[PDB]
Amino acid sequence: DDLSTAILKQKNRPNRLIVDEAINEDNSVVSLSQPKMDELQLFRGDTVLLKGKKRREAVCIVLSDDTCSDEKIRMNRVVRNNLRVRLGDVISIQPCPDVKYGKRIHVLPIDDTVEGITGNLFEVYLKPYFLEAYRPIRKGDIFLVRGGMRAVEFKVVETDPSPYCIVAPDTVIHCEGEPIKREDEEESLNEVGYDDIGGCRKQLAQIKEMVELPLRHPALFKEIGVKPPRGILLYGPPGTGKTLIARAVANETGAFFFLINGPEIMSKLAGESESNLRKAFEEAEKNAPAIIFIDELDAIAPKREKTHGEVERRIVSQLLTLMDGLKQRAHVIVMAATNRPNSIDPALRRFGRFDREVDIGIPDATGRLEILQIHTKNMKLADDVDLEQVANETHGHVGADLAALCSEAALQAIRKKMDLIDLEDETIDAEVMNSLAVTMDDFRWALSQSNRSH
Template identity: 45%
Template sequence: MPTPKSVPYSDLISSLQSGGVAKVLFEEGTRRIYYNTNLWSEKDSENAVDSGNNVDGKDTSVKKKSRNSPPAWEFLTRKIDHDESYLLSLMRERGTSYGSSPQSALMSMRSMLITVLTLWIPLTPLMWILYRQLSAANSPAKKRRPGNLLVSFEDVEGVDSAKVELMEIVCCLQGAINYSKLGAKLPRGVLLVGPPGTGKTLLARAVAGEAGVPFFSVSASEFVELFVGRGAARIRDLFSVARKSAPSIIFIDELDAVGGKRGRSFNDERDQTLNQLLTEMDGFESDINVVVIAATNRPEALDPALCRPGRFSRKVYVGEPDEEGRKKILAIHLKGVPLEEDVTLICNLVSSVTQGFVGADLANIVNESALLAARRGAEKVSREDIMEAIERAKFGINERQTSATTISKELVKLFPWMPSLTNRNNSRKDPQPPLGYQTLS
């Protein structure tokens, strides 16, 4: 059937005031109003036909509409908000019959679809983020199997005193007989303190590789969460997983992010996380073989309760390597790098002019020299590339003239038998050093 004709709301009010409306129908859940006029109702009654058949003396008359009968409703309009009382009073005054009908299935599906599109689709990413934040699967603990850790104490040089201290942790984890006979207990925590780039994280990986136990690494900043209580919950999850894999090692990098002194700020979440860490490290369960290794370069910012004996009872200082340590570190980083000269000669040369450099600086020098050699299309790294990399590390990239002069003066004082490195047009074949130099080195 054809749809009703849409008219303004004022037409309905005018028809009601003139008494020309016969029926009114309100659709529930929408603002639609259907109505018929008196003329339409008379036409609808005229189109109705009675057809009856006498069956066994009984008259069965059925009222049917013709195929060309008009639709049930003539007009369609939309109501005005807060005008229902006036409309109802007007229909009662005029004696108009009115009623209501439930919303059609099509309109119900349409309204439901609009609700989903406008409400649930924007909320779905927020709900997923909230679920990820609150779920236990979002634990920061990352377990690394010992087979995947290719780092041992042989790969760590320049920090011999720290290696000796950490070797005892490895022996206790492996259950050495001489430690158990004397009643020595496994230290609960080891704090690695030192300047940035000295190899604290590398030492922790070496401990896990030597001990052959599960190794859980996490950054302290991952415990700082927006939601209250989530940092403490992540601490509990981390230690719970580590206890199930005991003996194991937990490595917390940049401990000062969560272990700062309490009461300095208004961040209660950070204090709750630190309290949970203190409880886990020295709580009621004291016989669990879980070692916590933490690294920081700001030990003065840590809470005193965290550094007391029983928690981080052993503090290992990882300082800057000396000249002999820098030689060993360079020898490790130069493995696999093709050089035009002897590796020992390059290590002696670089270590003598890099006072105060740590392992990260030396690794960067080796990488920069390889990049410089690749830039000029060489197949091997030359001494000039390494010297230029040292200049970049010491004085920056934009001060090459000043840095070249300074490096050359230092090299002339240390190695007077070498030609000046600033003269790039000299022969690439260097003279042999004196015999006494080889003996002293």
């Protein structure tokens, strides 16, 4: 019970701290209480490594704060964004003593932050920002600089040494080149992680313990004297978030991750399907520790009765040989997913192939609420919107149905303003845009539309 969720549990360790809002918005500074600093043997101005979500790190300078709780850490928006975390998240912290003065770094602006300006970015933004500051930075940091009544966001593109360094007086700063697309950063910002997955707490644990844990700590298993299984089959009815979990795992794992899509393999010429398959397992073998995810498995490995093609049968044979071909030293794990488990060739569910199965099933009322929260987090909701109530009125709905419910709600909200907006306008009136919100009534409407559908 508490044991099956062991692996998700937040650890009462001294280096686990809760993210709180920052007093002062200096992008390189984070604040602890002094007893907390004493405990972790951190002195004022030490350089530290933070771990947030989705493999993110930040390097910061740690400072004392008497308004900061012992168990809390203050950090401005910029650092939180770099760690992919929100206020209330828990992050981990360690000294970083190894961190060298940078020889050069390359940064570039975000494009929607600069259109247009003459000014020299180094002279006007970056030199005053870095001047005698000896700021720590990491490849992939985004940071904001003020200058002359304007603010400019930069991305760290390269450091030398990589991936982090301290920017000294003698560090060469390059700012020259094509500005970074905002849309491209907004794509990255919105990668799926584990916190985008609602209602699957137990199955995320099963996955973490059959996939992440044995690739990350193969010692545990050798010590106690057992081989971890190598084939994990996610199953469940449509829209329960199997593919979502695949994307989360890809963005959270420390392993090399290779996605195979069923239909896409099956769309290839004879022989090229087989080739790609072999190449996937070869690449993962070579780049171990590694995960292969086969999404929509049923497409490439239906029951050898179903499939009236000799090539289609040849492909399944190839899969099975590739699975069996995973010699025990490879550290490769294969996950796969299907909404039709009975439709899969049974030989794939034998010992040493897909020998563990995880039911990504229909969520319950509490799960549905988690889902609704995740989905609406970036939505403009009115105060009347009671998601708990919506959770309670959506029995048998799965994640995908809840997403569409929320789309339908929104669209109704938009419908309510269609007397001001024309298809033929080039523009949307701003006070119309800013007042736009999804009401409970909109959700009520959507709900009632969904009882035909179900």
